[PDB]
Design a protein around this ligand. Sequence first.
Ligand SMILES: OC[C@H]1O[C@@H](O[C@H]2[C@H](O)[C@H](O)[C@H](O[C@H]3[C@H](O)[C@H](O)[C@H](O[C@H]4[C@H](O)[C@H](O)[C@H](O)O[C@@H]4CO)O[C@@H]3CO)O[C@@H]2CO)[C@@H](O)[C@@H](O)[C@@H]1O
Ligand SMILES: OC[C@H]1O[C@@H](O)[C@@H](O)[C@@H](O)[C@@H]1O
Length: 562
Amino acid sequence: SRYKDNRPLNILGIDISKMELGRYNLFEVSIFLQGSYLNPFDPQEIDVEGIFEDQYGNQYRVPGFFYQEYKRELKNDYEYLVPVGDPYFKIRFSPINIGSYKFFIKVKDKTGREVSSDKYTIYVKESEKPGYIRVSEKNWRYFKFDNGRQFLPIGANICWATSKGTYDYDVWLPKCAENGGNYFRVWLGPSWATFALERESVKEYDLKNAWKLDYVLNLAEKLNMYIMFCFDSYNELRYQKEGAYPYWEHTPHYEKNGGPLKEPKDFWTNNEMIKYYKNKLRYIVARYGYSTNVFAWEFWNQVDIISPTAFVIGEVKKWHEDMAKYLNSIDPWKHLITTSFAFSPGKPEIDSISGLNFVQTHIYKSNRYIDALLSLIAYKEKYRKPHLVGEFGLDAGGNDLWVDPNGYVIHNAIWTTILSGASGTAMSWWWDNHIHPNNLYFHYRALADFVKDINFLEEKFERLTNYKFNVYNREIKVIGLQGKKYILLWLYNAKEAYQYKKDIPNMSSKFLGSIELLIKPPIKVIYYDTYRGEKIKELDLDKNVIPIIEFERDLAIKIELL
Ligand SMILES: OC[C@H]1O[C@@H](O[C@H]2[C@H](O)[C@H](O)[C@H](O[C@H]3[C@H](O)[C@H](O)[C@H](O[C@H]4[C@H](O)[C@H](O)[C@H](O)O[C@@H]4CO)O[C@@H]3CO)O[C@@H]2CO)[C@@H](O)[C@@H](O)[C@@H]1O
Ligand SMILES: OC[C@H]1O[C@@H](O)[C@@H](O)[C@@H](O)[C@@H]1O
């Protein structure tokens, strides 16, 4: 209770960031107050709310949150945050409609006393921002922004920093964004994570780490990147003797460390833990919900590999149902909600919950992973909602780093997933020790430039079905999509795609073979170098047999039905 107060409830001062702002931009209110509360993160101790109303009758009830300002510095190799001023409360709002808004502040503390501000008026002008990310109503396999443009996530996991903290994101994010990236994922647990809110406690949240997450979210805003926030990771509920980077013995949830839980199984049903978890959801909505750069709320990283002593499917399912309902109810902007599993096929009992707006796959497989990705993407079409391959690698043990310095594994996965019908690219691990130092971003740039012009929401793509390969030289396979106006092909050499020793292909002319498709000419055929990210050749065709030019590892082909 380092932040307690014991004074009569009074608003002392209010600062407003701007009186005029653009659609979907941040409107921030700072509130100085006194009151009676033992825990500023607990709404039963103090409840700050901002009540906003547009000129179309829509009302928004925005929870407020406790805030400490910091000034960051880099002490050679670690980030250091200096507190600036006393902590205070904030409200963060984002307007969906333009025009005028009225708002006021309401505060209630543990005594039952309630105080409020007068009403203030702000004006909202049109902006360039596309809005929040939703599931597409036109094609449930894909995401859209509120303004109807597609959101096709291209990026990687970038889940935590080194000791350099936000200074690492200063480096990684601009590199990702200038190479076609618009997506990453961050972890808000376990307590060692850069953005861990439950660092020393599950009752009070870490104001330094929350400030770091502010900073990174603001950088994503400047770079037009969209973030999945992963609230908790399985390690928190996994015993040391179970391996796999366990953390139960160190986690604040455990009674040994001051928490309410005698064992991780009790996480799902312990009344005190559920209360604190809802307080955390409220804090996250309060502090970050305004942002259109929050792509999704993700409850768990791999909840199926918590301790087997703790995984009771019926309880984990009910907890996801109840928390998704609660989170959706308090989130004024109704961000997408998801969860994840280490088991690649997932858990249908949980994945089919209506409150989870999209499903995910994690897969670390070294042999024939192209076929595995295709099979999992076909399988999870049964849920009739988008599918994100949220984690991908060769090997949970990290063999990728030395067996595949050129990123061919990442390459294979991002082309396979996009041209198999997934909502976006397979999302690689190893951002810090592999993608960045080996400068693998060019793979994303090539893929982004191939798909940028394609409107996946209107193409009605289906997996390519009725093709005939005529190739004698080699064993070529194809992953493809057939749409109303485009056919997109990724061809790969089955005997080269899984070998990682050779240099990046630096190809060339010759005829290799052909593929004929169930389509009607005339057509324009574009051959695309997937490593340089360039058109190689264009060809106008009068019939349905597509020549395949020579290529070393893989080749993309874009066919336009004229
Ligand atoms: O160094 C900072 C921080 O690292 C922590 O360990 C990390 C580890 O370095 C590595 O990045 C690991 O990546 C996992 C990650 O958990 C993914 O969600 C996913 O998972 C796997 C899981 O970890 C097991 O290996 C499991 O058997 O297989 C899962 C995949 O199916 O895969 C990634 C690659 O393995 O993440 C851990 C943390 O989870 C800690 O060492 C910490 O002390 C340290 O500060
Ligand atoms: O910023 C990402 C990485 O960049 C490198 O050049 C070093 O400065 C690392 O300390 C840092 O973690």
